[PDB]
Amino acid sequence: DCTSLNRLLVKRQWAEAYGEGTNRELLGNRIWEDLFANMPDARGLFSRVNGNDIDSSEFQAHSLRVLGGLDMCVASLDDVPVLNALLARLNSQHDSRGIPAAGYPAFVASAISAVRATVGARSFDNDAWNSCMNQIVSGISG
Amino acid sequence: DCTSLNRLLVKRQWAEAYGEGTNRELLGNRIWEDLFANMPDARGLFSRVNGNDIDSSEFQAHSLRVLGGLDMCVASLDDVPVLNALLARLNSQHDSRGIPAAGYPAFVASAISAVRATVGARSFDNDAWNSCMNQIVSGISG
Amino acid sequence: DCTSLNRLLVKRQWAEAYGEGTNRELLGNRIWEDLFANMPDARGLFSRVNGNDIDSSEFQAHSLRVLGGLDMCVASLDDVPVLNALLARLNSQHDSRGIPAAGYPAFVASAISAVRATVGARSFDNDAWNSCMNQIVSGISG
Amino acid sequence: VCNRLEQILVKTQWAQSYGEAENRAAFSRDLFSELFNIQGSSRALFSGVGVDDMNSAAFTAHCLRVTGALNRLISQLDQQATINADLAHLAGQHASRNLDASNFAAMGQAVMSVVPTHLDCFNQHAWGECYERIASGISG
Amino acid sequence: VCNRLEQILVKTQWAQSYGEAENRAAFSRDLFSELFNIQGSSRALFSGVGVDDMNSAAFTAHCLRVTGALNRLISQLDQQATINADLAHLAGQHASRNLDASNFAAMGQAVMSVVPTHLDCFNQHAWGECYERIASGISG
Amino acid sequence: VCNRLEQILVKTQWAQSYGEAENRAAFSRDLFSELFNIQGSSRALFSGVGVDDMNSAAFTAHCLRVTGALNRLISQLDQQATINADLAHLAGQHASRNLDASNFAAMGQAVMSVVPTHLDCFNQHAWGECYERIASGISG
Amino acid sequence: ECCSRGDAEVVISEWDQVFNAAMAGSSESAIGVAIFDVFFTSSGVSPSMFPGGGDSSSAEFLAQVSRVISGADIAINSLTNRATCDSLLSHLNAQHKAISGVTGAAVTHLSEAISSVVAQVLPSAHIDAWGYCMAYIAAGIGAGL
Amino acid sequence: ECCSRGDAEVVISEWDQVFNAAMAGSSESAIGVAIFDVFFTSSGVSPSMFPGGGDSSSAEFLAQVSRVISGADIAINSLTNRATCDSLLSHLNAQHKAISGVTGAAVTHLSEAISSVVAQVLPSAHIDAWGYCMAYIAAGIGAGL
Amino acid sequence: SCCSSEDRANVMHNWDAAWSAAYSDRRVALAQAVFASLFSRDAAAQGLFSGVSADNPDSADFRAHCVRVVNGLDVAINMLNDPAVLNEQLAHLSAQHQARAGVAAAHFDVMAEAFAEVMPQVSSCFSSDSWNRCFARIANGISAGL
Amino acid sequence: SCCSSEDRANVMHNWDAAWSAAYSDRRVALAQAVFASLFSRDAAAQGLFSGVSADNPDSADFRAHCVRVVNGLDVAINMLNDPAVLNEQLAHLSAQHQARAGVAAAHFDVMAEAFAEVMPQVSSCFSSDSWNRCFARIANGISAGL
Amino acid sequence: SCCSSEDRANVMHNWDAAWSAAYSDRRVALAQAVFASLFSRDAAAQGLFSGVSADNPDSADFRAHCVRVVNGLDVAINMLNDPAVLNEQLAHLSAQHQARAGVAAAHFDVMAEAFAEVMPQVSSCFSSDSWNRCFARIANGISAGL
Ligand code: HEM
Ligand code: HEM
Ligand code: HEM
Ligand code: HEM
Ligand code: HEM
Ligand code: HEM
Ligand code: HEM
Ligand code: HEM
Ligand code: HEM
Ligand code: HEM
Ligand code: HEM
C-alpha cells in the first residue's frame, strides 16, 4: 500500500524518532543492536566499518550514513519520481556486496522497532510503516 | 502457597503496575511482547484478534480484556469462593481453543516480569507472585 | 592492552555505573539478568545462593559480593602488584567449583554491557573495557 | 515574484506569527485595527459585519475569514496552479466591493505591521514580494 | 512625506526598538545581518570594516555608527532645517561609495525587518514614508 | 609531617576550595589580599607584576601562577620524590627574591584564612602540617 | 457541554499539527482530497457539484478543496470561543442555504470525513472529542438543511 | 571568535574532570607522561632538552612534567577571561623565548598532544572546542617562535 | 449528551478509586447492590440471569457474575482515554449481548439507573452528571443492535 | 575562522528547521537552487555532473542527485555535536571526491558561495557568519587532498 | 546505640567519598593505616594474619589483604540502605570468621578503634558519632557467634 496519508504519517514520525544531532545516534544504536542480535551473521558484512565495535567513531559514521540514506528516502516518499531515482542509486551501492536477501526484511524490522520504541507504541501504525518501508528496501535489494 | 499476606502484596503491586487508563496498555504491551518473543507459536493463537499487529485497536481491546480478567482474579485473591467461580468461568472460555499447556506458565512468566519491570525489581517477592499466579492459571488451564 | 590511560577511564566509568548504596544492585541486576539469558546453564552454578530468585536477599548479597570483588580489582587496575595478589586470591575461591571456562567471557560481556547501559553508549570505549576486563578475569579463571 | 525559496520563508513565518486558536482571533483583530489606523476610509467598507464593535463576534468572525483566506493562500503558495485558481475566485468576489489600489496597499502595510510583532525574525523583502503576489491576484 | 504626526510615531517606536547600551549593538548587528541576507552583493561594500567577522569590535563599531546616524536623524525628524543639513552632509559622504538605489531599498527592507521584531506595535506605513524621507536625502 | 592520610584530606579540601575557571582567579586574588592585609610590607615585593591594581590582568595572572603552583604541589603531595624535586626547583627560583621566614608565615596564615571560607569542613591541623611541609621546601 | 473547552483544545492542537501553512501545499491538498474521497462515498454526493468536478488533478478542484477545509480550519481554531464560532458557522450556514443540493446529512458526512482522515494521519487522535466538536460544527453549518 | 566562551567552558569542565588536585599524583603523572610521549613523537624534540631526560621514572622529569601541564592547567582555567589569559600566555611566551630550542611548531605539537590524550581518557570530549582553545593557547605561548 | 474530556477524567478517577484491585470487599458489595437495584426496578430482568443463580444472591456463583459484569464496565471506563480501542471493545460486547436471547436496549436504561443509584452511595466525590453521560457513551455502544 | 559551540548550535537548528524530513517540497527546491547557483558562478562545474543529467535540471535523475548531495551536508551538519564521528565522515567523503576526476578544492569555495546565496533566502532566522564558519569546517575536511 | 537513617546517610556518603574506585592510591594508604593501628593496639592480633605476610606490610600480599578486608566493609556500608541484604551479608561474614581459629568478638572492638583513629585523619567532614554507631551495627552482625 503506502497511501498518500501513510507517507505523511511515516515522514512525521521518522523525523521525530530520527531527530537532530546526536539523537540520530540513539536511533541508529537501537537499529544495529536489534539487527545484530536477531541476525548475528549481519555483523560480518560491516567488517570494513568496524562492525565489531558499533560504538567506535568509524561505525557511527557508517551508521549515520545509512540512516541518512533512509532519511533521504523517507523525505521523498511523497515524491515518487525522485524516490525511484534515489533507490536506483542506492541499489548500485549495495549490489554484488554479498548482502543476504534476508537482511533487508530484518533491517526493516529493526528500523520500525526502533522508531516505535522512540515515538511510543500506542496507536503506532505498523501497517503504514511496513508498507512504506517495503517500498524503499524493494528498490534497494537485488 | 499464596498466603493471606501474599495476596495483599500481590493485590497492591498488581494495582500499581496495572494502573488506570492507558497505563494498562503499557503493562499489556510488556506482557505480549515478552510472551511472543519467548514463545513465537503463541501469536498464532490470536489470529482472530490480529495478533500480528499488537498495536492495532483490535488486539489492544483483546489485551485489555485479558488483563481485565487477570485483574478480576487478582482482586478476588482474598475471596477464595468467588475466585473459584471466576476461574471456572474463565476455564470455559479457553477450553478446546487449542491452547498449549505450556502457554500458561509462559504467560505467568511474562505477567510477573512485566509487573516486576513496572514496580521495581528491588525486594520484589517472586515467591508470592509465582505462587499466587499459579493458583489463578491452574484454575483456567485444562 | 589496558594502557595506563585505559585504566583511568575504566576506573572512572566503573565508579559511575557502580555508584553508591542500592545503585549497585541496579548494576548487578543488569549483569545477572543478561548473563542468565545468554547462558542459562550459569544459573545452576549459583544454587547455593538462590540463583533461581535473583531478587531474594540471599542472591543480592552474593551479587554485591561479586561486584565488590570486581570493584576491588577495578580500583587496583593502576596498582599492578596489588592487583595480581587480589586476582590470585580470587582464583582460589573459584577453582574446582566446576565453573565452565565460557562463563568468564560471558560475565565480562554482561558486565561491560551493563556499564555501557548505565553510563551511556556514546563514545563508550569497548576496547579499553574489554582489554582491562580480560586482564582481570584471566587472573581468576583457571 | 515570490520564488520557491521566498515561499518557504513566508510560509514558515506566517504559520508562526498567525498562531493557533484564540491567538488567531487577536491577530486578526490587530490586523484590521492597523488597517483602520492606516487608512481611516477603509473602516466604512465593513459596516455590514459589525465593525462598530471590533470585539463583537460578527466582526471577529469576518477578520478570521480574511486571515483564514490569507492562511489558505500562503499554504498553497508553492502550488502555483492551485493558488492562481483560488486567487481568481477571490478576485471575482471582491470585484463588486468598490475597492481601489490604495485599499490593498493599506492592507499590505497592515500585514507588514502586525506579522513581525509576533516574530523574532522577519524578512520584509520576501514578505513584500509574496504579499504583492497574493494581492495582485485579488485586486484584478 | 513624513508629516509631523508620523514623525512622533516613528520617533517613539525607534527609541523603544533601538534600546540602550548593548541592546543597541545586537540591534545594529541584526540590521546588517538582514541587509546581507536580503542583498548578498552589499556585504563586500563593507570589507574595510571587518565584515569577515560580524561579531568583531571593528564591524560592531561600524554598525553602531550607521544606526547611531539613523538615531540622530530620527531624533531631528521634527526639525526640518536641521535634518536637511545633516542629510546633505551624509549625502556628501556616501557619494563616493559606489552605491545604487537597490542598496538603499535593501537597507530600508532591513529596517522594516528588524525594527518591528523589538516592538509590540509597529506602523509600517509611517515607517515607509519616514524612512523614504531619510534615505532619499542621503542617496542623492 | 603531612602523613599519607593528611595528604588525602588536604588534596580533597584544596581542590574543592580552589574551584574551577574564574573562581580560581577570585580565590587567588583573595589570597594575596589577605597576605597584604596580614603583612603590609609584603605588597612591595610584587611591584613588578602590577600590584598597584589587584584587579588588573597582570596581577591576576601572577596570583594564578602562585596558586597554580600550590595546586600542582598539593596534587603531587602523595608522590614524595616528585614533590621534593618540584619544591627544590621552586626553592631555587625564590632564593634571589630577598624573602624571609615571616613572609612565608604570613602566606601560610593567608592560606589558612581564604581556604576555609570556601568550605563547609576544614581540618586546620592537617593544613598546618601539610602547608609547613610545602613552605619549608621552598623557603630553604 | 458538547465540545467542551477541553475537547476543543485537543482537537485544535491535533488539527494544527496535521494542517498548517508551514506544510507543503501538495500535502494539504493530499489531505483535503482524501477527505473529499471519503465524503463522496459516504454521502453519495455527485462530484460534478464542485468546480473541477472532483478531479484531483484539476487546479479548479484543488482550490475548491482548499477553500472548504480552510472554512473548517477557521471554525476548528475558533472552537474555544463559542460566540465567535457560532457567528462563523452562521455565515457558513447562510452561504450553503443559497447552494442547491446541500443537505444537513451531507454536511455531517463531510464533517465526519474530516475526523476519520485526521485519525489516519494521526492515529493518536482524540476521536471522541473530534466527533463531538465536528458534530457541533456540522449542526451550525447545516441548520435547516 | 576562536575559543568562544562556550568552547572555553566545556574545555575547562572536561579538563578539570580529568585533571585536578584531588586525584593521585601518580595518575596526574601518568597523564602528563602520556602527553609528553605523544609530544615527543609528533615534534621530534629531543627528550634530553628536559630535566630528567624524558625518563618517566626520574623524579626530576616527573616534576618537570608537572610544571608544564600545570602551566597549561592555569591557562585552560583562565580561558573565560581573555585579558587574564593573554597575560598568562605572554608570561609563558617570554619564558620560552629565553629557552634555546623552543619553536612555535613544537608548542603546537605539545598543545595538540594535550587534546589527544584528554580524548583518550575522556572519549566524549569536545575535540573541536579543544582544538580551537589549545590553538589559541599555542599561538600565545609560541608567538615569535 | 456528550461524555467530554473533563467528564471521562472525572469518571475514570472516581470509579478507579472505588473499584481498584488494591482494595478488598468492595467489588462484591458494589456489584451486588447494582444487581439488587436492577432487579428492584425490573423484576423481569432476573429471568435473564438464571444460569448464574440469581435467586441465591450470596452464592459464590452469583457474586462472581456480578463482579464479572461490573468489571467489564471497569475495562470500558478505563478505555475512555483511547476511544479507538473502546469502540473495538464495545463492538465486541455488543456481539456477545446479541447472542443472548431477551436482552433488549431498554434493559441498559434500567442498568444505568442501578449504577446511578449505587455510585452516589459509595463514591466519595461523585458527579452524577459526568457519570450519566459517560455511562451512556459506553452503554449506547453495547446496546446498539438489540 | 572557528566554528564555535554557539555557531554549530545555531547552524544545526536553522538547517534542520528547513531540511527536516517532516516537510515536503523543500529539499528539491533548496537543492536545485544550490546547484543552479553553482552553475551560475562556475559554468565549468556542470561538466563534472554529466552522469546525473545536469542539462535537464527538472529530471528526477538530477533532482535526486541534488537531494543526495545536499543531504550529505545534512548528515555532516548534524555530526557537529560529535566531531570525532564527523572527522571519520569527512575522511570518508574526501576519499570519494578524490576518486572523481576534475574535482578541485576551489570548487568547494564556489559551493560555499552557492549555499551562502541560497540559505538566506530560505531560512527564517539565518546567521551568515555562523554558517560560513561551520560550512568551512565541514568543507575543508572534504576538500583536503584535492 | 542505633545507626539511624541520618547516620547511615552521612556515613555512606563520607566513606564512599574516600573509598571510591574512581580515585587511586587511597585504598592502600587507608587500609594499611587501619591495620597498622590494629597491631599497635593489639600486638597479639598480628599472629592471626600470618598467611598474608603481616610482618612485611609493604608487600603486595599484605597490601592486597588490607584492601580485601576493608573493601568488605565498603560492601557492607553500602548495604545500609537495604538492611535485609545486609543481614544476609553479615551472616555470611560471620560464618567465615567462625571458621578462623582465634578470632574473638573483642578483636572487633579493637578493629573499631583502628577505624575510629584512621577515618578522622582521612575523611574531610567526618562524624565520629555516626561512624561509631553504624560501624557497630555492621561489626556486631559479624562478631556474633565468636
Ligand atoms: C533502507 C535501507 C538501507 C539504506 C538506505 C542504506 C544506505 C546505505 C548508505 C547510504 C551507505 C553508504 C555507502 C558509502 O558511503 O560507501 C551504505 C553502506 C553499506 N550498507 Fe546499506 N543501506 C540500507 C540497508 C542495508 C542492509 C539491510 C544491509 C545489510 C544487511 C546494508 C549493508 C551495507 C554495507 C555492507 C555497506 C558498506 C559499508 C562500508 O563498508 O563502507 N545496508 N548503506
Ligand atoms: C490469567 C491468565 C488469563 C486470563 C485471565 C485470560 C482471560 C481472557 C479473557 C477475559 C478473554 C476474553 C474472552 C472473550 O471476551 O471472548 C480471553 C481471550 C483469549 N485468551 Fe485468555 N486469559 C489468560 C491466559 C491466556 C493464555 C496463556 C492464552 C494462550 C497462550 C490465552 C489465549 C486466549 C485466546 C486465544 C483468547 C480468544 C481471543 C479471541 O479470539 O477473541 N489466554 N482470555
Ligand atoms: C571479575 C569476575 C568475578 C569476580 C570479581 C568474582 C568474585 C566473587 C566473590 C568475591 C565471591 C564471594 C565468595 C565468598 O564470599 O564465598 C564469588 C562467589 C562466587 N562466584 Fe565469582 N566472581 C567473578 C566471576 C564469576 C563467574 C564468571 C562465575 C560463574 C560463571 C562465578 C561464580 C561464582 C560462584 C559459584 C560463587 C559462589 C557463590 C556461593 O555459593 O556463595 N564468579 N565470586
Ligand atoms: C489581501 C487579501 C484579502 C483576502 C485574502 C480577502 C478575503 C476575504 C474573504 C475570505 C472574505 C469573506 C467573504 C464571505 O465569506 O462572505 C472577504 C470579504 C470582504 N473583504 Fe476581503 N480580502 C482581502 C483584501 C481585502 C481588502 C484590502 C479589503 C478592503 C480594504 C477587503 C474588503 C472586504 C469586504 C468589504 C468584504 C465583505 C464584507 C461583508 O461581507 O460585508 N478585502 N474578503
Ligand atoms: C540609510 C541610512 C544610512 C545611514 C544613516 C548611514 C550612515 C553612515 C555613517 C554614519 C557612516 C560612518 C562613516 C564614518 O564615520 O567613517 C557610514 C559609512 C558607510 N556606509 Fe552608510 N549610511 C546609510 C546607508 C548606507 C547603505 C544603504 C549602504 C550600502 C548598502 C551604506 C554603505 C556605507 C559604507 C560602504 C560606509 C563606509 C565603510 C567604511 O568606512 O569602510 N550606507 N554610513
Ligand atoms: C608558599 C608557596 C609559594 C609558591 C607555590 C610560589 C610560587 C611562585 C611562582 C609559580 C611564581 C612564578 C614565577 C614566574 O613564573 O616567573 C612566583 C613568583 C614570585 N613569588 Fe612566590 N611562591 C610561594 C611563596 C611566596 C611568598 C610567601 C612570597 C612573598 C611573601 C613570594 C614572592 C614571590 C615573588 C616576589 C615572585 C616574583 C614576582 C615577579 O615576577 O615580579 N612567593 N612564586
Ligand atoms: C464541514 C463541512 C463544510 C464546510 C466547512 C464548507 C465550507 C465551504 C466554504 C468555505 C466554501 C467557499 C465559499 C466561498 O467561495 O467563499 C464552500 C463552497 C461550497 N460548498 Fe461547502 N462546506 C461544507 C460542506 C459542504 C457540503 C456537504 C456540500 C455539498 C453537499 C458543499 C457544497 C459546496 C459548494 C458546491 C461550494 C462551491 C460554491 C461556489 O462555487 O459558489 N459544502 N464550502
Ligand atoms: C602548551 C605548551 C607548553 C606549556 C604550557 C609550557 C609551560 C612551561 C612551564 C610552566 C614551565 C616551568 C617554568 C618554571 O620552571 O617556572 C616550562 C619549562 C620548560 N619548557 Fe615549556 N611549555 C610548553 C611547551 C614547551 C615546548 C614545546 C618545549 C620544547 C620544545 C618546552 C621547553 C621547556 C623547557 C626545556 C623547560 C625547562 C626550563 C628550565 O628547566 O629552566 N616547553 N614550560
Ligand atoms: C454497561 C453495562 C453492561 C456491561 C459492561 C456488561 C458486560 C457483561 C460481561 C463482561 C458479561 C460476562 C460475559 C461472559 O462471562 O460470558 C456479561 C454477561 C451477561 N450480560 Fe451483560 N453487561 C452490561 C449490561 C447488561 C444488561 C443491562 C443486561 C440485561 C438486563 C445484561 C445481560 C447479560 C447476560 C444475560 C449475561 C450472561 C450471564 C451468564 O449467563 O453467564 N448485561 N455482561
Ligand atoms: C559540502 C559540500 C559537498 C558535499 C557534502 C558533497 C557530498 C556528495 C555526496 C553525498 C555525493 C553522492 C555520492 C554517491 O552517491 O555516490 C556526491 C557526489 C558527487 N560530488 Fe560532492 N559534495 C560536496 C561538494 C561537491 C563539489 C563542490 C563538487 C564539484 C564541483 C562535487 C562533486 C561531486 C561529483 C562529481 C559527484 C558525483 C555525482 C555522480 O556522478 O553521481 N561535490 N557528493
Ligand atoms: C568490620 C570488620 C571486618 C570485616 C568487614 C572483615 C572482612 C573480611 C574479609 C572480606 C576477609 C577476606 C576473606 C577471604 O578473602 O577469604 C577477611 C579475612 C580475615 N579476617 Fe576479617 N573482617 C573484619 C574484622 C576482622 C577482625 C577484627 C579480625 C581479627 C582480629 C579479622 C580476622 C580475619 C582473618 C584472620 C582473615 C583471614 C585472612 C587470610 O588468612 O587470608 N577480621 N575479613
mmCIF file of N, CA and C and ligand atoms in Angstrom, chain A residues 32 35 39 42 45-46 48-49 62 65-73 90 93-94 97 99-100 103-104 107 133 136-137 140, chain J residues 92 96, ligand 1:
data_model
loop_
_atom_site.group_PDB
_atom_site.id
_atom_site.type_symbol
_atom_site.label_atom_id
_atom_site.label_comp_id
_atom_site.label_asym_id
_atom_site.label_seq_id
_atom_site.Cartn_x
_atom_site.Cartn_y
_atom_site.Cartn_z
ATOM 1 N N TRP A 32 20.976 -1.161 15.025
ATOM 2 C CA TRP A 32 22.066 -2.113 14.833
ATOM 3 C C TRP A 32 22.146 -3.111 15.983
ATOM 4 N N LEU A 35 19.324 -5.524 15.128
ATOM 5 C CA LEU A 35 19.607 -6.307 13.928
ATOM 6 C C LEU A 35 20.660 -7.373 14.200
ATOM 7 N N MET A 39 20.106 -11.323 13.968
ATOM 8 C CA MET A 39 20.793 -11.860 12.794
ATOM 9 C C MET A 39 22.289 -11.660 12.987
ATOM 10 N N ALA A 42 24.868 -10.774 10.174
ATOM 11 C CA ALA A 42 24.859 -9.480 9.502
ATOM 12 C C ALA A 42 26.044 -8.617 9.919
ATOM 13 N N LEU A 45 29.111 -8.450 7.653
ATOM 14 C CA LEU A 45 29.010 -7.631 6.450
ATOM 15 C C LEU A 45 29.631 -6.254 6.634
ATOM 16 N N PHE A 46 29.828 -5.820 7.877
ATOM 17 C CA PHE A 46 30.318 -4.483 8.185
ATOM 18 C C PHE A 46 31.723 -4.513 8.779
ATOM 19 N N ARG A 48 34.484 -3.823 7.274
ATOM 20 C CA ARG A 48 35.266 -2.687 6.804
ATOM 21 C C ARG A 48 34.959 -1.412 7.577
ATOM 22 N N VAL A 49 33.820 -1.353 8.266
ATOM 23 C CA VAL A 49 33.447 -0.176 9.042
ATOM 24 C C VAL A 49 33.371 -0.532 10.522
ATOM 25 N N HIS A 62 29.409 5.296 9.653
ATOM 26 C CA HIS A 62 28.675 4.399 8.764
ATOM 27 C C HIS A 62 27.199 4.354 9.133
ATOM 28 N N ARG A 65 25.497 7.374 7.972
ATOM 29 C CA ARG A 65 25.357 7.360 6.520
ATOM 30 C C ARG A 65 24.133 6.554 6.104
ATOM 31 N N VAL A 66 23.943 5.387 6.722
ATOM 32 C CA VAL A 66 22.797 4.540 6.406
ATOM 33 C C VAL A 66 21.500 5.239 6.790
ATOM 34 N N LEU A 67 21.419 5.710 8.035
ATOM 35 C CA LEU A 67 20.231 6.431 8.476
ATOM 36 C C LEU A 67 20.004 7.683 7.639
ATOM 37 N N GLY A 68 21.085 8.343 7.218
ATOM 38 C CA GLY A 68 20.944 9.448 6.284
ATOM 39 C C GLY A 68 20.334 9.011 4.966
ATOM 40 N N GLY A 69 20.726 7.832 4.478
ATOM 41 C CA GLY A 69 20.118 7.311 3.266
ATOM 42 C C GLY A 69 18.650 6.979 3.452
ATOM 43 N N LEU A 70 18.302 6.402 4.605
ATOM 44 C CA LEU A 70 16.901 6.122 4.897
ATOM 45 C C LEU A 70 16.107 7.414 5.041
ATOM 46 N N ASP A 71 16.639 8.369 5.806
ATOM 47 C CA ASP A 71 16.021 9.688 5.909
ATOM 48 C C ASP A 71 15.813 10.303 4.531
ATOM 49 N N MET A 72 16.821 10.181 3.664
ATOM 50 C CA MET A 72 16.719 10.665 2.292
ATOM 51 C C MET A 72 15.501 10.083 1.587
ATOM 52 N N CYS A 73 15.294 8.770 1.726
ATOM 53 C CA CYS A 73 14.178 8.116 1.049
ATOM 54 C C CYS A 73 12.851 8.442 1.721
ATOM 55 N N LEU A 90 20.937 3.841 -4.685
ATOM 56 C CA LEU A 90 21.238 3.034 -3.507
ATOM 57 C C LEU A 90 21.413 1.564 -3.862
ATOM 58 N N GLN A 93 24.979 0.890 -4.919
ATOM 59 C CA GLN A 93 25.964 0.856 -3.846
ATOM 60 C C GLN A 93 25.909 -0.427 -3.028
ATOM 61 N N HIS A 94 24.879 -1.257 -3.212
ATOM 62 C CA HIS A 94 24.735 -2.487 -2.447
ATOM 63 C C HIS A 94 24.845 -3.755 -3.282
ATOM 64 N N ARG A 97 27.656 -6.786 -3.243
ATOM 65 C CA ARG A 97 28.341 -6.702 -1.960
ATOM 66 C C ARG A 97 28.184 -7.971 -1.130
ATOM 67 N N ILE A 99 25.299 -9.127 0.154
ATOM 68 C CA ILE A 99 24.312 -8.902 1.208
ATOM 69 C C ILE A 99 23.190 -9.926 1.075
ATOM 70 N N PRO A 100 22.942 -10.745 2.098
ATOM 71 C CA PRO A 100 21.861 -11.734 2.008
ATOM 72 C C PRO A 100 20.506 -11.058 1.863
ATOM 73 N N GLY A 103 18.539 -9.837 4.874
ATOM 74 C CA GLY A 103 18.975 -8.712 5.682
ATOM 75 C C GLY A 103 18.063 -7.506 5.590
ATOM 76 N N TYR A 104 17.369 -7.346 4.464
ATOM 77 C CA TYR A 104 16.534 -6.169 4.254
ATOM 78 C C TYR A 104 15.210 -6.272 5.009
ATOM 79 N N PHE A 107 16.429 -5.646 8.555
ATOM 80 C CA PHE A 107 16.705 -4.234 8.807
ATOM 81 C C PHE A 107 15.413 -3.440 8.938
ATOM 82 N N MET A 133 8.077 1.193 4.304
ATOM 83 C CA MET A 133 9.453 0.709 4.369
ATOM 84 C C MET A 133 9.724 -0.361 3.319
ATOM 85 N N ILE A 136 10.674 1.025 0.017
ATOM 86 C CA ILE A 136 12.033 1.552 -0.028
ATOM 87 C C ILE A 136 13.039 0.429 -0.251
ATOM 88 N N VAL A 137 12.984 -0.616 0.580
ATOM 89 C CA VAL A 137 14.005 -1.657 0.507
ATOM 90 C C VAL A 137 13.846 -2.507 -0.748
ATOM 91 N N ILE A 140 16.042 -1.181 -3.272
ATOM 92 C CA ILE A 140 17.464 -1.286 -2.969
ATOM 93 C C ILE A 140 17.964 -2.718 -3.120
ATOM 94 N N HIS J 92 35.842 9.964 4.994
ATOM 95 C CA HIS J 92 35.137 9.100 4.050
ATOM 96 C C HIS J 92 34.712 9.879 2.812
ATOM 97 N N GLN J 96 36.001 9.699 -1.475
ATOM 98 C CA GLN J 96 35.049 9.581 -2.573
ATOM 99 C C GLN J 96 35.228 10.693 -3.598
HETATM 100 C C1 HEM L 1 16.711 1.381 3.730
HETATM 101 C C2 HEM L 1 17.768 0.575 3.886
HETATM 102 C C3 HEM L 1 19.242 0.982 3.626
HETATM 103 C C4 HEM L 1 19.759 2.167 3.252
HETATM 104 C C5 HEM L 1 19.022 3.495 2.973
HETATM 105 C C6 HEM L 1 21.196 2.019 3.144
HETATM 106 C C7 HEM L 1 22.083 3.011 2.783
HETATM 107 C C8 HEM L 1 23.459 2.933 2.806
HETATM 108 C C9 HEM L 1 24.375 4.027 2.572
HETATM 109 C C10 HEM L 1 23.976 5.485 2.253
HETATM 110 C C11 HEM L 1 25.621 3.564 2.681
HETATM 111 C C12 HEM L 1 26.902 4.408 2.499
HETATM 112 C C13 HEM L 1 27.697 3.886 1.306
HETATM 113 C C14 HEM L 1 29.014 4.608 1.195
HETATM 114 O O1 HEM L 1 29.070 5.822 1.524
HETATM 115 O O2 HEM L 1 30.006 3.962 0.767
HETATM 116 C C15 HEM L 1 25.547 2.147 2.985
HETATM 117 C C16 HEM L 1 26.606 1.283 3.183
HETATM 118 C C17 HEM L 1 26.505 -0.068 3.433
HETATM 119 N N1 HEM L 1 25.333 -0.752 3.709
HETATM 120 FE FE1 HEM L 1 23.412 -0.112 3.359
HETATM 121 N N2 HEM L 1 21.520 0.717 3.458
HETATM 122 C C18 HEM L 1 20.348 0.051 3.760
HETATM 123 C C19 HEM L 1 20.260 -1.276 4.124
HETATM 124 C C20 HEM L 1 21.321 -2.147 4.289
HETATM 125 C C21 HEM L 1 21.244 -3.521 4.760
HETATM 126 C C22 HEM L 1 19.920 -4.219 5.146
HETATM 127 C C23 HEM L 1 22.494 -4.030 4.774
HETATM 128 C C24 HEM L 1 22.999 -5.438 5.194
HETATM 129 C C25 HEM L 1 22.248 -6.382 5.779
HETATM 130 C C26 HEM L 1 23.393 -2.984 4.320
HETATM 131 C C27 HEM L 1 24.762 -3.097 4.192
HETATM 132 C C28 HEM L 1 25.649 -2.084 3.895
HETATM 133 C C29 HEM L 1 27.080 -2.231 3.723
HETATM 134 C C30 HEM L 1 27.870 -3.552 3.840
HETATM 135 C C31 HEM L 1 27.593 -1.027 3.451
HETATM 136 C C32 HEM L 1 29.083 -0.725 3.186
HETATM 137 C C33 HEM L 1 29.741 -0.148 4.433
HETATM 138 C C34 HEM L 1 31.184 0.154 4.128
HETATM 139 O O3 HEM L 1 31.987 -0.809 4.019
HETATM 140 O O4 HEM L 1 31.525 1.357 3.991
HETATM 141 N N3 HEM L 1 22.647 -1.861 4.033
HETATM 142 N N4 HEM L 1 24.209 1.798 3.055
#
